[PDB]
């Protein structure tokens, strides 16, 4: 097991809508998965076939959680929309969003300059050979996460491709960094599969668990995530 670390920053702003006209503050790992699968199909890579597999259970993408001037990731504030890093507060929040009115199109973005965590957890080392190639393409051109990729919104640039290994969590009690798939969890989560080869945009809805919640689970390996805490 290993992971590729990164201080992924935004060249142009990203627009990710949620339900209830909510715009997400930071970019999520689902968006990274959806973009990297387009990369692997576009470069005729084999893992693209696994990219259209939503339960491959290797190459799991952790959320692009924002990084602070404290050098640490903003830990998500428990049961709250905004985030707060363990060192100081520096609290992210909505102020970073801007209401956009552009040619009829009224939407929102999140501004550029803030840095976000790259963390691609990979299990199979055979997949790491293609993983080095896809992080090496982004290294040259960039990745686009958001809406209006063809208009140019969402351009991301890595500044630190680091393939440093890691180990899973220890405590059973873990904090939910990202929203987790837990049935009858009363926190509705929506994403989609596009399947551009065969069309049929999906808009898959679910009722998983929300982020910022301490939960005890001995059967935990750590799209939810496990914070060691």
């Amino acid at each position: 097991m290993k992971e590729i670390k990164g201080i992924l920053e935004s060249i142009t702003g990203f627009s990710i809508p949620l339900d209830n006209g909510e715009y997400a503050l930071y970019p999520a790992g689902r968006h990274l998965r959806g973009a990297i699968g387009y990369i692997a199909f576009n470069l005729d890579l084999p893992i693209s076939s696994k990219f259209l597999d939503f339960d491959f259970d290797d190459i799991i993408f952790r959320d692009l959680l924002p990084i602070s001037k404290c050098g640490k990731i903003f830990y998500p504030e428990k049961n709250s929309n905004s985030l707060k890093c363990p060192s100081c507060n520096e609290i992210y929040g909505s102020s970073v969003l801007r209401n956009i009115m552009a040619r009829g199109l009224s939407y929102k973005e999140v501004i550029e300059g803030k840095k976000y965590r790259l963390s691609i957890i990979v299990k199979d080392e055979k997949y790491l050979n293609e993983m080095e190639a896809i992080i090496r393409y982004i290294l040259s051109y960039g990745i686009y996460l958001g809406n209006k990729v063809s208009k140019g919104y969402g351009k991301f640039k890595i500044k630190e491709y680091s393939i440093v290994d890691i180990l899973p969590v220890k405590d059973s009690e873990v904090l939910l960094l990202s929203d987790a798939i837990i049935d009858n969890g009363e926190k509705d989560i929506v994403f989609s599969k596009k399947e551009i080869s065969s069309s049929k945009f999906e808009i898959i809805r679910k009722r998983g668990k929300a982020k910022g919640d301490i939960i005890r689970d001995n059967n935990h390996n750590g799209f939810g995530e496990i914070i060691s805490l």
Binding site: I11, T12, G13, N42, L43, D44, R98, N99, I100, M101, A102, R103, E109, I111, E112, G113, A133, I134, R136, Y137, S140, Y141, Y144, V149, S150, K151, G152, Y153, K155, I196, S199
Partner: protein
């Protein structure tokens, strides 16, 4: 497989204006300038580039003879059959070209100036209304990177044709009064293996 990459550097030849889309930053700037220029929060100027390339190929190919889908119309909903919808987008499948914003190489303090624009009466020959609009100086180098996946043979030539149509009509806003005339320098690259 081999996706087509077009590095488009743009040099501003007459002052550029593109209005700012974000309401909060536009409201913040409205104090100093009635018309703020479109700016990033990294203090750099971004320009929309997809729509101008699209509308260039729309009017050129429409009057050429190849029937296309007039976008920017009353309804503006496009087909999935004509050439522009195979390049710059369709109501169903994604467009084959990803057109990045023309980000600037320089910063706000080095290219962006506030200016007195005017409205003069035709009998008293004196200024009736004055307003303060922001522009980008001439000789300012912007950059963008077009991404045409599934490359057809008439792709780079069509993009260059559209850029010539943009070099003569202009990019941005206030296009009829002389704002927006630029030059485009173009380089191309296919990428195969990484």
């Amino acid at each position: 497989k081999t996706m087509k990459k077009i590095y488009v550097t743009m040099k501003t030849l007459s002052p550029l204006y593109t209005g700012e889309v974000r309401r909060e930053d536009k409201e913040a700037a409205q104090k100093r300038v009635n018309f703020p220029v479109r700016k990033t929060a990294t203090n750099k100027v971004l320009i929309p580039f997809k729509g101008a390339l699209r509308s260039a190929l729309e009017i050129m190919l429409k009057a050429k003879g190849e029937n296309v889908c007039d976008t920017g119309e009353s309804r503006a909903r496009p087909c999935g059959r004509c050439v522009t919808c195979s390049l710059f987008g369709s109501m169903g499948r994604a467009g084959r070209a990803s057109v990045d914003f023309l980000i600037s190489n320089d910063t706000k303090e080095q290219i962006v100036r506030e200016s007195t624009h005017l409205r003069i009466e035709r009998q008293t020959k004196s200024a009736s209304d004055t307003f303060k609009g922001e522009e980008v100086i001439e000789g300012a180098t912007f950059t963008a990177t077009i991404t045409i996946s599934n490359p057809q043979e008439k792709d780079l030539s069509l993009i260059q044709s559209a850029l010539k149509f943009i070099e003569e009509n202009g990019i941005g806003g206030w296009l009829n009064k002389g704002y927006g005339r630029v030059s485009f320098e173009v380089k191309s690259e296919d990428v195969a293996t990484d």
